[PDB]
Amino acid sequence: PMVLLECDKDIPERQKHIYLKAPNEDTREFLPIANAATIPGTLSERGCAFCGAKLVIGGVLKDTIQMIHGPLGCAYDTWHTKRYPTDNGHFNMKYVWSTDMKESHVVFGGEKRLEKSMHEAFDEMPDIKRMIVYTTCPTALIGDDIKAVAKKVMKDRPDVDVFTVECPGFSGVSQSKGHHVLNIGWINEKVETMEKEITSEYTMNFIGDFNIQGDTQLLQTYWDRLGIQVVAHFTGNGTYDDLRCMHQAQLNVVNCARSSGYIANELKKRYGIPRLDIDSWGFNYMAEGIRKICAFFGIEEKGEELIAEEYAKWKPKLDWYKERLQGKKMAIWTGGPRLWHWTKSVEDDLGVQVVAMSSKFGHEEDFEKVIARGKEGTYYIDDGNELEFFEIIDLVKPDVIFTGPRVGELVKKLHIPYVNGHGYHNGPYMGFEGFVNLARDMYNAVHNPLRHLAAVDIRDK
């Protein structure tokens, strides 16, 4: 049934966001409202649309200035917070750029301040020739025309290319809108503006993977073994110009259908490129994905050789962790997709029972997926808030929580260990090896002498 938690008695509208799956229910009658307005004052986990554009997608790129048109906080706040390495010395994590909006810009306009900052950034780093410009709350409100400014800079600097995103933080209800605006703007403005050499008979884009702790680079070992050219990664370990070439691919393989389904859907509509949805977390899921990719291309036997090798290398260690993790109870409090990518894979491959899940920004589609794959007796929460987390803990008594570090630090006080479900503990976590890494961190989290010591009161005889 839907659940009215005690801490929500004065915000009873939350009932329609929380589902406790019970036997025999028709789940179509119990789908949480999702992607609706946030209730003020709740300590919702949500962030802003600008986050979804710059921090999550655009900022992953290795060779691109991330020009945040706004006051300095939006830039500060999106720097030193992500774990998406590159193979060029992590340019993307080392720098952030602001137009340092001041009061005079609010009153008289910020377009010249932006133009000047763009030139400056290109002058300071003459080897960097690509940029994304993002709006933020106040530059949206005053109506600065960042596309126009970008077009002028491009005319003055024929060596560069600039993309613009209108994504103030108050757009939409969460970071989701930033995903949407960036995807649609990129396909409308930048896809099909360049081409690259095709060097394989098998080509794909890999859509919706952001190289957290090297996930993309690990998956690339598979594509290189299989002889498949990745035209573009959207956007893990990616380049700006690879994304301009996405129309060239034969296949779009999608992992994050929430952040990046938009562009896959438009690439299919405009170019006929089929969309293949996979799970690139999970051991048995990773095999299924490789088998589907190989079936599409007609290289089934290559895929079986790869899978057999990876099972022989990593399945015994996975099974060691399974023996020890069987029956443990897990909660997943993250953005959305990792709920449906992980609930059944940790159950199948590790014997772990996911007892509670919360999605910051997921849509109804994400809830369809997670409820389909998830267990009876589990709580499914849209746009969870802090006091709810405490009540859910009391209800389900998880052995481990996969969530962000700040929530991890909170639930430590209750003697519940965490694994960073966003940026990982010791990743990567995608692929065959990555699920072993996940399992290891789960095991170390729970099998931890400190938890037992913390429960001892030394004054008790």
């Binding site: 946030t38 802003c48 006051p71 137009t99 103030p168 909170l410």
Partner: protein, 464 residues
């Protein structure tokens, strides 16, 4: 010796030194017991700052958002503030203080915060006749100043709000102390100094319990210890000791003007002389003697520093960045131990104030070498100077400058906020005598490790 101030020569920023004003107002508020700040603006303005605090302290702190969305961005956000206040009060029965912190968005759209507070006060008095909730308007447009100024603004507004409500009463016999933006370990040290001097004081804000235990009973103790009652009592103090010109002195000034509590601004107590002078001023205002225990702690610090200064520190060139009180004070500490702080970077638009700081002349009269002070600086300004050939032996700053030091292969000591890339620094004092000692030993140990990794006379670490 010439100490030259210059501004950043670029309009834009690359690698900002500070966050925006609202972030600092949130930091001020989280140090109050039974306080949940409410940040009126888009959601990122809250959630990114909660993350920042988790990076520095490895703890959660409660801050709420009004969740400005598109409707409210066009048609006004007063109902988001008002709903957020009520949702807080309804769900947190022990909540007493809500600083209502503006952002760039709600400053641009002109929401009338004071009017929303009148509305909320009426609503709250009707709904909760037995409670009193203090709502403080905190005007922190992010397109001015920085988190330094926002912290100062928030402290001042919360003190104005609470002391307006309570006024002046019985003299307390206590000092008010505004240490500024410091770590829990700095507050621990100050509390020890007042205790050893037999001086009653409130430290505003008392953040000691930000370093909270993991306890057998699973209780959560990660809270500010400064109460409403503590704040109200500031009107009754003997005197205010303000340690930080840019981080609370304006509150000491407001209490002087409003309540005739004399404010004494002193140099922020980094290094020996500044700590001496702080303790002298405490003795003067209280009539209490400095105790032998502090002469001993001082002496232990000097003994430790004397093992390092001429041997390892002399003639070594240092760049320092961080909050202005910390930069200026650390530069003074560095000269006591023969380091040469040749580049000081201060990160915001307050240069007209910094040019008048008396410490600038103090640095001019004690420097054996030219100093450049870059104001309105970003951290690219440091990186670009090193790229152009500035030769540094040490960087002292916060963790968001780490890649500059890593890539240039320069040892770096983590100071100020945030220091997320080392463990435990929030517990270690940097001010006072113990703190001078601890800073100096961090510097030496960072140089020592660097000598080992680079094979630079690593054999010399035997009989120093």
């Amino acid at each position: 010796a010439e100490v030259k101030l210059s501004p950043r020569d670029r309009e834009g920023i690359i690698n900002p030194m500070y966050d925006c004003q609202p972030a600092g107002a949130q930091y001020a508020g989280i140090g109050i017991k039974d306080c949940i700040p409410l940040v009126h603006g888009g959601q990122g303005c809250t959630m990114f700052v909660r993350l920042l605090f988790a990076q520095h302290f490895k703890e959660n702190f409660d801050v709420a958002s009004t969740s400005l969305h598109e409707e409210s961005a066009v048609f006004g956000g007063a109902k988001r503030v008002e709903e957020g206040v009520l949702v807080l009060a309804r769900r947190y029965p022990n909540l007493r203080v809500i600083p209502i912190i503006t952002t760039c968005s709600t400053e641009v759209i002109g929401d009338d915060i004071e009017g929303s507070i009148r509305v909320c006060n009426r609503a709250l008095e009707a709904e909760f006749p037995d409670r009193k909730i203090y709502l403080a308007p905190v005007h922190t447009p992010s397109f001015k100043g920085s988190h330094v100024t926002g912290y100062a603004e928030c402290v001042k507004s919360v003190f104005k709000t609470i002391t307006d409500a309570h006024g002046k009463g019985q003299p307390s016999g206590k000092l008010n102390v505004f240490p500024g933006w410091v770590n829990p370990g700095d507050v621990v040290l100050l509390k020890r100094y007042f205790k050893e001097m037999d001086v009653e004081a409130n430290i505003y804000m008392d953040t000691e319990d930000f370093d909270s235990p993991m306890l057998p009973n699973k209780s959560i103790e990660t809270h500010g210890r400064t109460t409403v009652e503590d704040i109200a009592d500031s009107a009754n103090a003997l005197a205010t000791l303000s340690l930080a010109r840019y981080e609370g002195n304006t509150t000491g000034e407001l209490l002087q003007k409003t309540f005739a509590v004399p404010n004494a601004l002193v140099n922020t107590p980094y290094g020996i002389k500044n700590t001496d002078d702080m303790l002298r001023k405490i003795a003067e205002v209280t009539g209490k003697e400095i105790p032998e225990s502090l002469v001993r702690e001082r002496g232990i610090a000097l003994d430790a520093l004397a093992d390092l200064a001429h041997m390892f520190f002399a003639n070594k060139k240092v760049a320092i960045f961080g909050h202005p009180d910390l930069v200026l004070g650390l530069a003074q500490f560095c000269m006591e131990v023969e380091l040469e702080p040749v580049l000081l970077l201060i990160g915001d638009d307050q240069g007209n104030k910094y040019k008048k700081d008396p410490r600038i002349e103090e640095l001019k009269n004690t420097a054996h070498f030219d100093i450049e002070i870059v104001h309105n600086a970003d951290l690219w300004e440091l990186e670009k100077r090193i790229n152009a050939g500035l030769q540094l032996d040490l960087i002292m700053g916060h963790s968001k400058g780490r890649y500059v030091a890593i890539e240039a292969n320069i040892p770096m000591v983590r100071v100020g906020f945030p220091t997320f890339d080392r463990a435990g620094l929030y517990r270690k004092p940097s001010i006072g005598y113990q703190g001078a000692m601890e800073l100096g030993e961090m510097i030496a140990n960072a140089m020592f490790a660097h000598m080992e990794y680079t094979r630079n006379k690593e054999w010399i670490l035997n009989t120093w």
